[PDB]
Amino acid sequence: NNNMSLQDAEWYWGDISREEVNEKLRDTADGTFLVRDASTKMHGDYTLTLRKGGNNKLIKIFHRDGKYGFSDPLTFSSVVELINHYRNESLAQYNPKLDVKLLYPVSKYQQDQVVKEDNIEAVGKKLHEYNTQFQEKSREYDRLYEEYTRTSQEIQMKRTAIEAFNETIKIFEEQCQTQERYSKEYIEKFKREGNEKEIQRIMHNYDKLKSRISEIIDSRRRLEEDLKKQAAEYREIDKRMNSIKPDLIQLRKTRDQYLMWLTQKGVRQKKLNEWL
Amino acid sequence: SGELWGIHLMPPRILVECLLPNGMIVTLECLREATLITIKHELFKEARKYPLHQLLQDESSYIFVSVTQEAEREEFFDETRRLCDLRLFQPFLKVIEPVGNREEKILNREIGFAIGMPVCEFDMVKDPEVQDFRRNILNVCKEAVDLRDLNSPHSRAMYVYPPNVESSPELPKHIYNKLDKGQIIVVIWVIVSPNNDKQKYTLKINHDCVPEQVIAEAIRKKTQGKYILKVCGCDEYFLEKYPLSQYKYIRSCIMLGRMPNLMLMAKESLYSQLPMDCFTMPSYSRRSTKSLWVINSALRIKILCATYVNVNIRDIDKIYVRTGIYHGGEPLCDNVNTQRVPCSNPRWNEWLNYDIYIPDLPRAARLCLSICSVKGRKGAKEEHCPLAWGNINLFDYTDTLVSGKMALNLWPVPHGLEDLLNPIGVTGSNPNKETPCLELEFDWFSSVVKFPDMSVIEEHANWSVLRENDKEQLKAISTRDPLSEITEQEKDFLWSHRHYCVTIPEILPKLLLSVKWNSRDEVAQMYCLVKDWPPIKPEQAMELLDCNYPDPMVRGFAVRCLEKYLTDDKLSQYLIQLVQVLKYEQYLDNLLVRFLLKKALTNQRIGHFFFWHLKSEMHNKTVSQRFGLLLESYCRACGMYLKHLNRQVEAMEKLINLTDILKQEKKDETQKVQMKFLVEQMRRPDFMDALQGFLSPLNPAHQLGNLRLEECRIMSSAKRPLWLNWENPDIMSELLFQNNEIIFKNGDDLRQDMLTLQIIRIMENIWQNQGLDLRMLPYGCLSIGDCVGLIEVVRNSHTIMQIQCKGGNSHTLHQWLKDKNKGEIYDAAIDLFTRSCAGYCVATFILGIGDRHNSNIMVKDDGQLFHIDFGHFLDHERVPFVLTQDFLIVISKGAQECTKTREFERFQEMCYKAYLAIRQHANLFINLFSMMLGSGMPELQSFDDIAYIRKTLALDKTEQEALEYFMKQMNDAHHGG
Ligand SMILES: CCNC(=O)[C@H](Cc1ccc(C#Cc2ccc3nccnc3c2)cc1)NC(=O)c1ccc2nc(C)c(C)nc2c1
């Protein structure tokens, strides 16, 4: 009741690497904790990972003379008794600055009730079919990302082209003001004398500037419309990836959960490796 | 690319329309290669058939201004430039009267070409920090320039030809045994001006003799302050007063049993080539508050409307904003969240409250926030997926707490990231204003809050305030690797004995993690210990520069250790990681940037690689501006090397453009059509002149000569890599080599391969000094852009696949080795294949590089073995010993009973001695990977990836225990042996 073997404890997880511990405590509430074997692998260490203040603490359960504890006085019969003492009380007694009541242990049994088809045959088919779903979904996501990155580059060079078009149009526009102002003092002299050749050439080529400048504006106009069309598709490509990412993550975790479940139950992965 | 927008083809004759000052328009048909000087001459004698001419009054006083492809209106002051290379946006050229300095504008055109962006871009930024950095970084540029010109033209030479020496004057014992009485036979080559006739010299001199007596003693055999010593071949000179064996070239000859041949060159001749350093300050160089500790209120941030988020209204139920104050990577409090709102009206008119008081905010605090979308479906499941992220510094570079409204642009989520927040990221707004935008508003205190200066912190510290037998625990903690787990009992133990840790300077990184950073009382005390801390080795002080130690004072102390201990020999080795650390700096004006820039402006070998490492990372939009400002400052004061860097950049651009057509346009064709097409587009003068007569980016000492179009094909591997072949311009080419072969890859990431080739070099240096003769061949690799790089080619190397195909079993590799070298050299060739084979077994297993086959394993005719094509590492214990049966025959000298042979037993011994040697240096390798987390490699996202090294090296186990872990792995792969 109060004190059974540490093996049959919902919070004890055995031997899990610190990489696995962090992912289980990630984005969890304050007070969540789980016991596990120490990194050194020496018998009787039982590091107690704790989550307080957004940080994942780490407290080692020292062992000496068949007794366990945190400080040098090991006044506890076993790990279960020691943890249970702090499950109903805060750790301020152990450390003045450490305030937590070890509320929410990460029970290993809860994840158990997520897998069905306890028989080997059914799990083999589900995991194999899930890998096809996970692999197909991942491939589809991979295709979108390359399109998303590719489309990002295309729009960037479209923005620069429009930026350059502003400079070119500005030069022609500015020169028109300068050209018109320049043709102000000699225009009267041309009108005074009957020289039609100068008028035709001045007007003929002056319109050429208008024609050339008009073409520049039209060319820029098409680019802006193309940029708008390209930009809209850029968001649509982004929309698909945003809605595919959450589904891919869930499939990957569920697929991994089945894979570990099969291996843990005394099954060599060589048979599963060919199953894929 | 190309010579015009969109159209990369340049017709020989094009109707180029100019704009004369009088507002006139006239069309011209110039040449593609015609210089702008000629264009002006022809253009001016073409207006006589036009309305007005009196305004011209001369042919000069006009600059031919126009627009470029970078959206920049270039001035074209250098009229000698050809119209082809002007990068015109559209055919047109406006004639304008000269304006500006006319000399500083020319430089800005060369600086822009090298950096890749117009220099005017930095001048259009209104950010006060961007402009302040530009005007302040010129102090380091000026100091370095003055430093170079201190003694004489000699000081100028040492800048352009930095001696490549080693920080190890004493030779390893085993190599010293290679010298008969500590003397090395060297042949000195002296060239006589009449007919340029060669000459010989046999010299037997002591290893520990500087070039001064080498040169003088050689004169006695001829039968002063001149006649410098140069390496026959590449540009490498023996100038500084060092022991002869101290240099890298002479040491390499000793290790490989070769007689170094050197050239005698007159000193005056070398100084003639040295140009003058003309560094002129640019135009931009000439152009109350209450302490933070008195503000009593919790840090409160108000969120507001998000401009827009790309989320489907039906796929995702609701969205919310997650925030949290971080210091480095560790939060300073619990992450706060905003009320979930439908993803159609992201209003969030909410005040966020944090559990941290304002006075307790560390100077390096950041506000990491992100937009997360909660699914809230699947019955009893709640999945959060980030939509964007953005970091905000709480103190601008002036030590002022951010106050008032502020608009922040979010970043796209990195690939393969699932954490809601991204604390390890660049703290700034997205330059692309067309992304999600989050509006924040920090509360106003009726005044500007300034972080207390140094004096105030000192008063608070030491104001609130013998030996111990159990000091062995402090010693034990120091040796633990950086990634090791530290318990709360040790954290509370290091801090209590912080004053006794000064006697163990190696414990500083561990004592920096035991201090609560959200408590000004504890942080104040720490600043005192760091102030008067003993200096540590650069290897240990290099780990205080990564993302785990963001305090400005902690990083400043680390840099001061680099300055006084980091030799230019080691600086060039770790320079790959030091550049990456520049992305972890909070602000643009750091102490590391001033240290890095001072070294680049003093050494031309460091500057060469400093330029290329920064340049290759300019495609990233996160560090595009930070590195762009860093390159512009260097390019302005780099001196006359910018002319050489223009040849390389221009040359590399031709290959990139050419290589993009063989994989984009002519990709669905045969192998002979591509080769003829590739050969066709190399005889053109534009391509021919650009790809000749410039230094090789991989090794600046190698000046690439005339191209050899006959022997340049397309590698039938990867994605059409291009096998380019060059010549050796110097007359002394046959001594070293007569061909510089370089593989130009365009489409493969060369950063994983560039980092592996550097870990191999460090591994081989550890074993060389220890005593082991494990010889590896870490060829030269370099990344010059986005998934484009160059690879050096090793001479006379065939893959194991080639021999099997050409040798046609299991004795083909051994049979070929026997045929190539028969006689007394067979034993050496069999022992070189053994030492080389053993070295790559330990290195390959530790790093877990991609699986090897007979296609990416090369064996030289001398018997040496080396690996190529380093695909991936650490991802793709669970990796076996790559040794295969094809090598046991060679190891056992052809014996069939290889399993329990005497030769094989010696092979196992050298594998254990190599494995244990690296295990004792695991700290160095853990720190190298810890400085590349932000690099962006797909397999180096976080410290989780680096956990592979801690497992293959068996760091937690015992030294004796770790040995049998390697034993089990080696036997398991071979199923015994
Ligand atoms: C079934 C079809 N088979 C082939 O067609 C073979 C296979 C084959 C040969 C050789 C390497 C190789 C290599 C290599 C790769 C990376 C390296 N990294 C560092 C150092 N050395 C390295 C050497 C691979 C593969 N021929 C080529 O593909 C080929 C193409 C162009 C060439 N052009 C020149 C100028 C020369 C000298 N040979 C060429 C060889």
Q: Evaluate whether B4 touches B90 at the Cβ level (below 8 Å).
A: yes
- Residues in chain A closer than 8 A to B480 (CB atoms): none
Shared domain for A237 and A153, answered yes or no, is: yes
C-alpha distances (whole Å) from B911 to each of B829, B846, B915 are 19, 12, 6
Q: Evaluate whether B183 touches B627 at the Cβ level (below 8 Å).
A: no
CB contact under 8 A, A39 and B956: yes
Three-state DSSP at B488 gives helix
- Cβ burial of A63 (10 Å; 0-12, 13-18, 19+) is middle
Three-state DSSP at B364 gives coil
Which residues are paired to B367 by β-bridges? B325, B392
Question: DSSP assignment, residue B374?
Answer: E
Nearest C-alpha neighbor of B371 from the set B341, B405, B407: B341
Phi-psi region of B467 (alpha: psi -120 to 50; beta: other; left: phi over 0): beta
Q: Find, in chain B, the residue whose alpha carbon is nearest to that of A152.
A: B432
CA angle B738, B739, B741 (to 5 degrees): 165
Structural domain ending residue among the three candidates A112, A147, A170: A112
CB contact under 8 A, B25 and A212: yes
For ligand 1, atom 39, which residue shows the shortest CA distance? B715
Question: DSSP assignment, residue B940?
Answer: -
B89 touches chain A (CB under 8 A): yes
For strands B228-231 and B384-393, give the pairing. unpaired
CB contact under 8 A, A19 and B944: yes
Interface list for B 659-688 with A (CB within 8 A): none
> How many Å from the N-terminal Cα to the C-terminal Cα in chain A?
43
Q: What is the CATH number of the domain that holds A144?
A: 1.10.287.1490
Non-local CB neighbours of B548 within 8 Å, separated by 6+ positions:
B328, B329, B482, B513, B930
- Cβ burial of A146 (10 Å; 0-12, 13-18, 19+) is exposed
Return the beta strands (E) in B25-117 as ranges. 25-31, 92-94
Nearest C-alpha neighbor of B203 from the set B190, B179, B191, B221: B221
Return the beta strands (E) in B232-317 as ranges. 237-238, 261-265, 289-291, 298-306
Distance CA B974, CA B968 (A): 10
Which residues are paired to B19 by β-bridges? B25, B94
The CA B790 to ligand 1 mean position distance, Å, reads: 15
- Give the number of other Cβ atoms within 10 Å of residue B242's Cβ: 16
Q: Evaluate whether B439 touches B306 at the Cβ level (below 8 Å).
A: yes
Distance CA B942, CA A242 (A): 23
Return the beta strands (E) in B61-201 as ranges. 92-94, 183-190
> What sign does the dihedral B26-B30-B36-B38 (CA atoms) show?
negative
Distance CA B32, CA B10 (A): 7
Three-state DSSP at A35 gives strand
Run of H or E residues at A226:
helix A196-264
C-alpha distances (whole Å) from B221 to each of B187, B200, B217, B262 are 12, 11, 7, 15
Q: Evaluate whether A152 touches A234 at the Cβ level (below 8 Å).
A: yes
Q: Which domain holds residue A63?
A: 6-112
Three-state DSSP at B348 gives coil
Shared domain for A99 and A133, answered yes or no, is: no
Three-state DSSP at B384 gives strand
Distance CA B446, CA B125 (A): 29
Structural domain ending residue among the three candidates A58, A86, A112: A112
Inside any domain, residue A264: yes
Interface list for B 330-369 with A (CB within 8 A): 330-331, 333-335
Q: Minimal Cα–Cα distance from B70 to chain A, Å?
A: 7
Shared domain for A131 and A178, answered yes or no, is: yes
CA torsion, points B499, B502, B504, B510, in degrees to nearest 10? 70
Distance CA B352, CA B334 (A): 12
Structure-determination technique: cryo-EM
CA torsion, points B563, B564, B570, B576, in degrees to nearest 10? -20
Shared domain for A176 and A219, answered yes or no, is: yes
Q: Evaluate whether A69 touches A62 at the Cβ level (below 8 Å).
A: yes
Q: What is the CATH number of the domain that holds A46?
A: 3.30.505.10
**Cross-chain CB nearest to B333 (options A53, A59, A238):** A53
Q: Minimal Cα–Cα distance from B312 to chain A, Å?
A: 6
In Å, the largest CA–CA distance within chain A is 123
Nearest C-alpha neighbor of A205 from the set B866, B835, B23: B23
Q: Evaluate whether B705 touches B686 at the Cβ level (below 8 Å).
A: no
Q: Evaluate whether B186 touches B267 at the Cβ level (below 8 Å).
A: no
- Give the number of other Cβ atoms within 10 Å of residue B651's Cβ: 21
**Cross-chain CB nearest to A208 (options B25, B69, B487):** B25
CB contact under 8 A, A205 and B25: yes
Shared domain for A174 and A93, answered yes or no, is: no
Which residue do the tokens 């090793």 mark? B794
Number of domains in chain A: 2
Distance CA B103, CA B119 (A): 15
B914 is written with which tokens? 């190599």
Print burial letters for B792-809: b (CB count within 10 Å at least 16), e (below 16): bbeeebebbeebbeeeee
**Cross-chain CB nearest to A54 (options B331, B373, B384):** B331
Shared domain for A104 and A156, answered yes or no, is: no
Shared domain for A173 and A83, answered yes or no, is: no
Print burial letters for B201-229: b (CB count within 10 Å at least 16), e (below 16): eebebebeeebeebbeebeeeeeeeebbb
Q: Find, in chain B, the residue whose alpha carbon is nearest to that of A184.
A: B22
Q: Resolution limit in angstroms?
A: 3.0
- Residues in chain A closer than 8 A to B488 (CB atoms): 57-59, 95, 98
For ligand 1, atom 14, which residue shows the shortest CA distance? B793
Inside any domain, residue A1: no
Measured in residues, chain B has a length of 977
CB contact under 8 A, B333 and A54: yes
C-alpha distances (whole Å) from A35 to each of A27, A46, A105 are 18, 6, 9
- Residues in chain A closer than 8 A to B92 (CB atoms): 168, 171
B138 is written with which tokens? 């010129």
For B334, half-sphere exposure in the C-beta direction (CA atoms, 13 angstrom radius) is: 12
C-alpha distances (whole Å) from B781 to each of A98, B720, B755, B768, B890 are 51, 18, 9, 22, 30
Residue type, B773: D
Three-state DSSP at B131 gives helix
For strands B351-357 and B298-306, give the pairing. antiparallel
CA-atom Rg of chain A in angstroms: 37
Q: Evaluate whether A171 touches B18 at the Cβ level (below 8 Å).
A: no
> How many Å from the N-terminal Cα to the C-terminal Cα in chain B?
58
CA angle B351, B353, B355 (to 5 degrees): 175
CA angle B627, B632, B635 (to 5 degrees): 120
Residue type, B251: R
Q: Minimal Cα–Cα distance from A84 to chain B, Å?
A: 20
Q: Evaluate whether B352 touches B286 at the Cβ level (below 8 Å).
A: no
The CA A143 to ligand 1 mean position distance, Å, reads: 31
Distance CA B461, CA B441 (A): 33
Residue type, B696: S
B472 is written with which tokens? 């062995």
Distance CA A10, CA A150 (A): 49
CB contact under 8 A, B316 and A250: no
CA torsion, points B729, B730, B736, B737, in degrees to nearest 10? 20
Residue type, A4: M
Measured in residues, chain A has a length of 276
Q: Evaluate whether B597 touches B634 at the Cβ level (below 8 Å).
A: yes
B372 is written with which tokens? 């997360």
A172 is written with which tokens? 């022609």
Phi-psi region of B823 (alpha: psi -120 to 50; beta: other; left: phi over 0): left
Nearest C-alpha neighbor of B311 from the set B342, B340, B339: B342
CB contact under 8 A, B956 and A40: yes
Distance CA B844, CA B301 (A): 50
For ligand 1, atom 23, which residue shows the shortest CA distance? B793
Structural domain ending residue among the three candidates A86, A112, A138: A112
For strands B722-725 and B713-714, give the pairing. antiparallel
For ligand 1, atom 3, which residue shows the shortest CA distance? B716
CA B975 to centroid of chain Cα atoms = 41
Distance CA B515, CA B521 (A): 10
CB contact under 8 A, B19 and A171: yes
Q: Evaluate whether B112 touches B569 at the Cβ level (below 8 Å).
A: no
Q: Find, in chain B, the residue whose alpha carbon is nearest to that of A164.
A: B71
Which residues are paired to B440 by β-bridges? B303, B406
Test the A interface: residue of B18, B367, B385 with most A CBs within 10 Å:
B385
Residue type, B96: I
For B759, half-sphere exposure in the C-beta direction (CA atoms, 13 angstrom radius) is: 29
- Residues in chain B closer than 8 A to A27 (CB atoms): 384, 420
Which residues are paired to B230 by β-bridges? B237, B263
CB contact under 8 A, B488 and A58: yes
For ligand 1, atom 16, which residue shows the shortest CA distance? B868
Ligand 1 pocket, CB under 6 A: B 711, 713, 715-717, 723, 725, 743, 779, 791, 793-794, 797, 868
Question: DSSP assignment, residue B756?
Answer: H
Run of H or E residues at B960:
helix B959-974
The CA B118 to ligand 1 mean position distance, Å, reads: 39
Question: DSSP assignment, residue B338?
Answer: P
Q: Which atom of ligand 1 is nearest to the CA of B712?
A: 35
Q: Find, in chain A, the residue whose alpha carbon is nearest to that of B483.
A: A18
Q: Evaluate whether B648 touches B697 at the Cβ level (below 8 Å).
A: yes
**Cross-chain CB nearest to B94 (options A22, A70, A175):** A175
- Residues in chain B closer than 8 A to A204 (CB atoms): none
Interface list for B 381-400 with A (CB within 8 A): 381, 383-385, 387
Q: Find, in chain B, the residue whose alpha carbon is nearest to that of A249.
A: B418
Interface list for B 503-522 with A (CB within 8 A): 516
Inside any domain, residue A224: yes
Three-state DSSP at B30 gives strand
Distance CA B918, CA B909 (A): 15
Long-range Cβ contact pairs of B410-413 (< 8 A, separation 24 or more):
B410/B370, B410/B371, B410/B435, B410/B436, B410/B437, B410/B438, B411/B435, B411/B622, B412/B388, B413/A245, B413/B386, B413/B387, B413/B388, B413/B389
Three-state DSSP at B379 gives coil
- Report the residue among B679, B682, B698, B716 best suited for mutation to probe ligand 1: largest number of ligand atoms under 8 A from its CB: B716
For ligand 1, atom 8, which residue shows the shortest CA distance? B716
Question: DSSP assignment, residue B731?
Answer: S
DSSP secondary structure of B829-867: HHHHHHHHHHHHHHHHHHHTBSPP-TTSEEEETTS-EEE
Distance CA B486, CA B189 (A): 61
Q: Evaluate whether B674 touches B720 at the Cβ level (below 8 Å).
A: yes
Distance CA B772, CA A188 (A): 96
Shared domain for A129 and A221, answered yes or no, is: yes
B760 is written with which tokens? 């191999």
Distance CA B270, CA B251 (A): 24
- Cβ burial of B339 (10 Å; 0-12, 13-18, 19+) is exposed
Shared domain for A137 and A263, answered yes or no, is: yes
For ligand 1, atom 24, which residue shows the shortest CA distance? B717
Q: Find, in chain A, the residue whose alpha carbon is nearest to that of B331.
A: A54
Shared domain for A105 and A89, answered yes or no, is: yes
CB contact under 8 A, B316 and A54: no
B494 is written with which tokens? 């290091």
The CA B715 to ligand 1 mean position distance, Å, reads: 5
- Give the number of other Cβ atoms within 10 Å of residue B690's Cβ: 18
Distance CA A152, CA B815 (A): 55
Inside any domain, residue A174: yes
Secondary structure, 3-state, B423-470: CCCCCCCCCCCCCCEEEEEECCCCCEEECCCHHHHHHHCCCCCCCCCC
For strands B183-190 and B261-265, give the pairing. parallel
Shared domain for A107 and A135, answered yes or no, is: no
B22 touches chain A (CB under 8 A): yes
Inside any domain, residue A124: yes
Distance CA A48, CA A102 (A): 10
Which residues are paired to B165 by β-bridges? B247
Nearest C-alpha neighbor of B877 from the set B786, B955, B792: B955
Q: Evaluate whether B755 touches B895 at the Cβ level (below 8 Å).
A: no
Shared domain for A97 and A163, answered yes or no, is: no
Distance CA B396, CA B393 (A): 6
Distance CA B748, CA B784 (A): 12
Distance CA B775, CA B910 (A): 12
CA B621 to centroid of chain Cα atoms = 17
Three-state DSSP at A201 gives helix
Q: Evaluate whether B302 touches B287 at the Cβ level (below 8 Å).
A: no
Question: DSSP assignment, residue B702?
Answer: -
The CA A36 to ligand 1 mean position distance, Å, reads: 52
Nearest C-alpha neighbor of B562 from the set B577, B585, B548, B542: B542
